[PDB]
Amino acid sequence: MEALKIALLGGGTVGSAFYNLVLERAEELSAFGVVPRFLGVLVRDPRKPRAIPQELLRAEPFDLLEADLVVEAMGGVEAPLRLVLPALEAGIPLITANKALLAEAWESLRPFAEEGLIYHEASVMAGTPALSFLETLRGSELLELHGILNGTTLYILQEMEKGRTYAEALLEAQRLGYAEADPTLDVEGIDAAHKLTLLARLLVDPGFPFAEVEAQGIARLTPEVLQKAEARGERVRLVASLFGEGGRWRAAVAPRRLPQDHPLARARGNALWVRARPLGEAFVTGPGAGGGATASGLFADLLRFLSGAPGHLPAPRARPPLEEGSPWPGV
Amino acid sequence: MEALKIALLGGGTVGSAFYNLVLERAEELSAFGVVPRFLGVLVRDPRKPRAIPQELLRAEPFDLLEADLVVEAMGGVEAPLRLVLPALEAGIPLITANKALLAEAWESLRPFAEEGLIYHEASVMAGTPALSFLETLRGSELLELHGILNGTTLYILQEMEKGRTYAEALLEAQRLGYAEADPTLDVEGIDAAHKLTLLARLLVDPGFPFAEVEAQGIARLTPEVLQKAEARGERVRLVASLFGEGGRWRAAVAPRRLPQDHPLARARGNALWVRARPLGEAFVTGPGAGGGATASGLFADLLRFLSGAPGHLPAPRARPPLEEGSPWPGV
Amino acid sequence: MEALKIALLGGGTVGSAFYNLVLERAEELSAFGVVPRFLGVLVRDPRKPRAIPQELLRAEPFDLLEADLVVEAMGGVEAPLRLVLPALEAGIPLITANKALLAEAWESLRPFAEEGLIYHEASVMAGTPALSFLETLRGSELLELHGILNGTTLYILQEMEKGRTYAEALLEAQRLGYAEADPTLDVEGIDAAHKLTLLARLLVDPGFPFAEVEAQGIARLTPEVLQKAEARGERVRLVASLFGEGGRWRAAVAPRRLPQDHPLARARGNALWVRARPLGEAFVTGPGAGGGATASGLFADLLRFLSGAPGHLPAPRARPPLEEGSPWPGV
Amino acid sequence: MEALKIALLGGGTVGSAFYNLVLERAEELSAFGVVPRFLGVLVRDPRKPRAIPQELLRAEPFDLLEADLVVEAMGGVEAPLRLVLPALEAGIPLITANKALLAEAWESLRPFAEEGLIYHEASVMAGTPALSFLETLRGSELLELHGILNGTTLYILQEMEKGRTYAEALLEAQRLGYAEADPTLDVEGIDAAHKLTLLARLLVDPGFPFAEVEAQGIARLTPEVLQKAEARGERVRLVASLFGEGGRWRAAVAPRRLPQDHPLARARGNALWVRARPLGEAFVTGPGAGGGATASGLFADLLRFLSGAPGHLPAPRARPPLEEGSPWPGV
């Protein structure tokens, strides 16, 4: 039996859900050979109301080199990056739910991803299987991928069909915990773009640049637009697409008119839909955002690590596109 | 004496400071024959402890059309937009501290700015005079403008100079209520870009696009780079620059090497430095972020409105630059 | 018109109610000649959830000598005492809701009370008139005083008559905000004893020692006892008594069997009952605990000060008792 | 392997630390063939953020009679008493950290202590061995005991020595989770008196009354008095003393002038110093307050219980002292 010493960065909705999940499942962990011991949890206010014991909180950075694992769910890019890099350099794995970090600091983080040090299931659709889904889909070659990767904007659109306004639905969305710190990342497509980028690097091109994703959010959408779509037998959704065009992978986020019976249209939560050769059509759906949902993903990754498996490896080499996609109707 | 009917959007660091500042200055407001009456205060979470009366909190949007003023300090772009437009269309002024909104929704908001309906001193360098400073600088023709517009990154570079880390500094500035909710906006220069855009529009080109600002942040800087600059007799700062190049106005945000005696290098606070013809060289500096500092700007604008002055007008035409310029050397 | 600069010690349920009340009533204050300006609010956690703007919070002591008034509602004895004494020494008045402080540090605080520097209506039965009540009763000579001075133990007994247990009622009492930090002060009679002491010093003996109060709390009481009392046509209540015996003032707190039609028994909140010569029988009742209720008392004292009146003066000399009381049935 | 059924009373600084410590040590507990199962956790406010599952929180008292252990860390005396007695009467052990309860409700609790049903290591000097230390010291006859039992006042006097104020120090210790909820209990010596009582009862007289302890606090001490002691080669500390005087045991808490090389003066932490016949002079020191420190004591007691050992027994008789003693000189 061994101690698994964990440094947690962030003690918010996710961090705190992860902390309590780990301790609540310590019996499971013992069957994996370990007892979980948190070194410290990095936060900003160490004395406010929080669902972690106060003495574990650290309002300043602390040395991570004695940890066996670093778990990050602090948000942002350059601050977690600088905090994680010395741990990575020492061969200490990272488990993160932070898609911005991986999408926008990939020049620094790719080499550690490639040696299997980075686990990040929770960074796309929370603890819904997305990355593991794609890992199994690698048995085939992608033809087209379409996801509804952002839960905030899904919630908002669901509410506006029901005739609620953007602002009341976003407000409602932010109470329920779905949005990023700044909901602009959600409603402009950027958070979907970060997720889509990570999917692209896993499946089709390990160098895929976040800057190459074309992203348009839901700012032109209203209840009227959505309800008129319903009347044509369609649903409008924000969709993240990956497809070949002129021999290269293209990545877009935009609102799309979907047939109402399409798997993407009938999903109540977040969803990833592929067509691949020779498998065919496959689809995964589940909760894409929330504390418990994300902590599930991070805990799934801890068990993966404990099992002796590497983190989520980028594609070993870029894959040649088989077909010209370019499906589509925008809005 | 008559009610001044205010709808306030946001009850946070800024909104709350503003609410309480208004209350305690009620004596001052009576000298205009008004008494301040809040129609409601839009907030996300009506349960958090707040220095605003529970009975005035609204967790859903409320009718604005009876207000004499809408004050906005909620953050984001699309949601505040959709909330203020009806008031603006009714000829109700807006007082805002939200630079993202004005930079990114200008196609919708410019017509109302041109009519004098938008007050936004607090949208740049908080209640430090920036917009009013530029309004006076209009007596001359701009040669060049350079500002340290972002308080969060000034704070960070000041603390890194003294040997503190990036991560520590950042944690503090967030604590002090300086950082945008997405602090990436601060540290990648985007928030300074938004501010720069507004200054360009006030001075030189009323349709200057936010997309035309070139922005880069502080992500490559460390305590070491800064300390080496100090030994060369310099300071590295993030600088927002507006200058002529090949007959057009260029807007850039980037780290710059400044001579250490330069006003920008020494300033107490955020700072704006302008050479213009025939005035010469003028400078303003003060706090550029903080609840109190921002509530001062908003309240300044409310007093401006009560005086019968219009809001901040865009430049009444676009005009080319007088002189070819450049910023300081990059890093 | 003048600035009234206020230093607040404590930003809890009371402190925060007082802060918001002051600002909410600044129009009233202007009719008294002043505009209220808080120098700072002393707390412990300056970044947690609180109904006061964060920049006013001070997590460390600050200089009080520039204030026009010090307002204290921090709890305890020696820490507020040391904080207030330099202000008192400088002739700066104190307004307090802190009965422990005044009861247990009277050797230090009496001399300042005697020069009218201490206002403390809110320290007995919150903003229910108690001290001002006694000030008017000084027109007569006390024969007997009996109060139900502690709201926690009143609540608890009210709930146990209804058949609820001590522990559920105390729990219920502490949620509703009635109890001291440690409810032992309430349930053992000590908080009533502190209040009774202050009443004694106002009315009958300016040197009355807190140590001379005999106090017994409600620890032997159960629903059964209380319900049996109801059946004999009585109510049991914790009562604070002041009466002459052998030519001296005696002070006791204890549970008592009251006739059910007695003013003390039929009071739903806290209550002070006197017999005095030549007035006769007089009685005041109201809320004895709670934020809003206490802030009312502190604000009543601020207006008193602004009116040019002194604070609550002790009796100028001990008064000779006229009759042997010693009413009573204990339980 | 069998459930160890625990009812926990209190979910605060101590309770929460305890809850999470139990969870993470579940592996260790399996070595006794148990798995820990919480039947519920009594709390005041089920809405505060807490590192305990919502579904286990109870805001009203719950049946305890199915528990194998009641752990108490709620504070107060009468309410915990009325809650544990039924469990105690059923032959269910109590593990407590509450020294006030044991000192002040001993007429009710002594019979169950005498039966081995009360574990209270954490009630004195937290998880620093104090009770177990004394249990071993029973191999000798006590000559004299002197301890620095109160962590809050040690902390305060340590910080005042270094020039900090009373008020600052106090604010900190409260922040660190050291202080009783009424910190007056700490600074007037009452909390050390409660602890002293329990040590007297374990060692010399199983009915030693709390009322017989003479207690005075640190209220006359300042940075100046302490600094002057240091210049005389001394340290002033609050000391809890048990010593023989005229054939009876005397118990006193007071500030004392200690030689600076004395173990009590130097100790790292709270400290207990005992001369006994024939052992000689023994000493123990460690942290005497804190969530983690206390949860360690409680967990030590739970392991003691699982080992088949009884709780902490009172002295099996009263006996007079062997030698006339005295404490150090007062201040």
Ligand SMILES: NC(=O)c1ccc[n+]([C@@H]2O[C@H](COP(=O)([O-])OP(=O)(O)OC[C@H]3O[C@@H](n4cnc5c(N)ncnc54)[C@H](OP(=O)(O)O)[C@@H]3O)[C@@H](O)[C@H]2O)c1
């Ligand atoms: N919630 C979701 O549904 C969800 C789903 C999937 C992925 N994620 C990802 O999880 C991350 C965090 O989200 P969350 O919902 O847990 O955020 P949250 O509730 O705000 O918590 C973020 C935590 O990080 C701390 N923190 C933030 N910036 C910091 C800095 N510069 N220095 C030190 N501490 C810092 C905060 O401290 P304080 O608490 O003191 O302020 C807090 O403890 C993000 O990357 C997000 O994209 C979230």
Ligand SMILES: NC(=O)c1ccc[n+]([C@@H]2O[C@H](COP(=O)([O-])OP(=O)(O)OC[C@H]3O[C@@H](n4cnc5c(N)ncnc54)[C@H](OP(=O)(O)O)[C@@H]3O)[C@@H](O)[C@H]2O)c1
């Ligand atoms: N802080 C500064 O230094 C500073 C300086 C100048 C300008 N500004 C600008 O001031 C604006 C507000 O900043 P801040 O510091 O006050 O942020 P803050 O502390 O987060 O306050 C945001 C307020 O708006 C509410 N809110 C956020 N999104 C909402 C939505 N979709 N619907 C309804 N209510 C919403 C929040 O409700 P809850 O409290 O219920 O969460 C909160 O009351 C930003 O535009 C910022 O760029 C800030």
Ligand SMILES: NC(=O)c1ccc[n+]([C@@H]2O[C@H](COP(=O)([O-])OP(=O)(O)OC[C@H]3O[C@@H](n4cnc5c(N)ncnc54)[C@H](OP(=O)(O)O)[C@@H]3O)[C@@H](O)[C@H]2O)c1
């Ligand atoms: N509530 C009532 O019904 C009531 C009625 C009449 C009289 N009172 C009296 O009012 C006083 C306070 O009561 P409350 O209900 O407002 O208490 P509360 O909600 O706990 O607030 C007490 C405040 O004082 C601060 N504080 C406490 N000790 C401190 C120290 N040593 N150093 C610095 N700051 C300290 C706290 O800081 P934090 O908030 O950071 O912890 C908090 O801001 C007591 O004397 C009480 O007897 C209360």
Ligand SMILES: NC(=O)c1ccc[n+]([C@@H]2O[C@H](COP(=O)([O-])OP(=O)(O)OC[C@H]3O[C@@H](n4cnc5c(N)ncnc54)[C@H](OP(=O)(O)O)[C@@H]3O)[C@@H](O)[C@H]2O)c1
């Ligand atoms: N802190 C230490 O260093 C230390 C060391 C040794 C012993 N102790 C002892 O441990 C005990 C608890 O101290 P602590 O630091 O954990 O205090 P704390 O942080 O205030 O926790 C008290 C807990 O009990 C709950 N509570 C209080 N009174 C209650 C009532 N009448 N009914 C139901 N629930 C009640 C509170 O509920 P909420 O959270 O809902 O408010 C809280 O969960 C005290 O007896 C103290 O003397 C403390």
Ligand SMILES: N[C@@H](CCO)C(=O)O
């Ligand atoms: N804010 C993000 C979290 C994970 O994608 C969302 O709404 O989906």
Ligand SMILES: N[C@@H](CCO)C(=O)O
């Ligand atoms: N985050 C912004 C707010 C004020 O514009 C700043 O740091 O300057």
Ligand SMILES: N[C@@H](CCO)C(=O)O
């Ligand atoms: N806890 C106190 C406040 C004022 O007496 C009470 O219950 O009455």
Ligand SMILES: N[C@@H](CCO)C(=O)O
């Ligand atoms: N307030 C107590 C808790 C531990 O007994 C102390 O300071 O020692």
Ligand code: NA
């Ligand atoms: Na996932």
Ligand code: NA
């Ligand atoms: Na400004």
Ligand code: NA
């Ligand atoms: Na009163």
Ligand code: NA
């Ligand atoms: Na102990």
